[PDB]
């Protein structure tokens, strides 16, 4: 469904070619048949599978990469499966100066087009496997937005098991990450959300309490996504 000149643009080594190449995919990502089966899954392969594909030396490319995946999120079918394919390594990009917005609104295309709750287990799922501290809090920043935008759709349970993991770190930025997440959490889960970190450590404990006062007397603004 790629004619092999945008096919071949894609692994040229040129990178200025690459760019034409995505860009050019990236212009057109719109009009494919959202009818045909699993055409998701073939856009998206396009730019995952190839090689280097999402390990993309040029950083602009790799922003263009990002925006193609995203674009077919927004307009075409997804499913769960093809954002398991390649959103680890878009979790990866979180910690990416140049390019960790562009990775944050594909992990947002990808809960519009399934489920927040879906992507939001898998981001804080790898975070945690995963080592660096700033894909760490960089991911804590992600699910607090999103449950702004989104609303709360989550379970309570195991998301304050999660945040509890990021509270607990030896990292700081880490820590405040998911410290204001607690904050944002208790603007719709209310005061009793306090009593699940009411055995933290004192200095940790005075920390939580501190976000939590400024935000639980908040009202949550309308969802604007997922809508």
């Given at each position: 469904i790629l004619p092999a000149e945008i096919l071949n643009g894609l692994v040229d080594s040129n990178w200025k070619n690459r760019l034409a190449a995505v860009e050019q995919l990236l212009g057109e990502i719109?009009?494919?048949?959202?009818?045909?089966?699993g055409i998701s899954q073939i856009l998206i392969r396009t730019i995952s599978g190839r090689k280097p594909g999402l390990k993309e030396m040029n950083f602009q490319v790799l922003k263009f990469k990002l925006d193609i995946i995203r674009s077919v999120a927004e307009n075409y079918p997804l499913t769960t499966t093809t954002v398991d394919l390649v959103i680890n390594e878009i979790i990866e990009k979180?910690?990416?100066?140049?390019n960790g917005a562009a990775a944050a609104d594909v992990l947002s295309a990808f809960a519009e087009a399934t489920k927040l709750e879906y992507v939001v287990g898998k981001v804080l799922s790898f975070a945690f496997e995963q080592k660096s501290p700033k894909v760490q809090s960089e991911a804590f920043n992600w699910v607090n937005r999103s449950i702004i935008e989104?609303?709360?759709?989550?379970?309570p349970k195991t998301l304050i098991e999660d945040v509890r993991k990021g509270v607990q770190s030896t990292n700081p930025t880490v820590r405040a990450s998911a410290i204001q997440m607690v904050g944002t959490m208790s603007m719709y889960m209310?005061?009793?959300?306090?009593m699940f970190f009411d055995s933290e450590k004192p200095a940790l404990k005075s920390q939580i309490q501190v976000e939590f006062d400024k935000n639980v007397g908040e009202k949550p603004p309308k969802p604007v996504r997922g809508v």
């Amino acid at each position: 469904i790629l004619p092999a000149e945008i096919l071949n643009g894609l692994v040229d080594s040129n990178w200025k070619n690459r760019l034409a190449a995505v860009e050019q995919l990236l212009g057109e990502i719109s009009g494919f048949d959202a009818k045909q089966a699993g055409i998701s899954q073939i856009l998206i392969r396009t730019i995952s599978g190839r090689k280097p594909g999402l390990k993309e030396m040029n950083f602009q490319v790799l922003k263009f990469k990002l925006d193609i995946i995203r674009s077919v999120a927004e307009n075409y079918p997804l499913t769960t499966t093809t954002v398991d394919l390649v959103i680890n390594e878009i979790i990866e990009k979180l910690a990416d100066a140049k390019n960790g917005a562009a990775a944050a609104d594909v992990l947002s295309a990808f809960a519009e087009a399934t489920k927040l709750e879906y992507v939001v287990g898998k981001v804080l799922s790898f975070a945690f496997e995963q080592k660096s501290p700033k894909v760490q809090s960089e991911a804590f920043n992600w699910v607090n937005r999103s449950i702004i935008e989104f609303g709360f759709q989550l379970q309570p349970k195991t998301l304050i098991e999660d945040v509890r993991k990021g509270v607990q770190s030896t990292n700081p930025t880490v820590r405040a990450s998911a410290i204001q997440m607690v904050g944002t959490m208790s603007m719709y889960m209310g005061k009793a959300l306090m009593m699940f970190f009411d055995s933290e450590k004192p200095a940790l404990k005075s920390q939580i309490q501190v976000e939590f006062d400024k935000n639980v007397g908040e009202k949550p603004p309308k969802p604007v996504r997922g809508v």
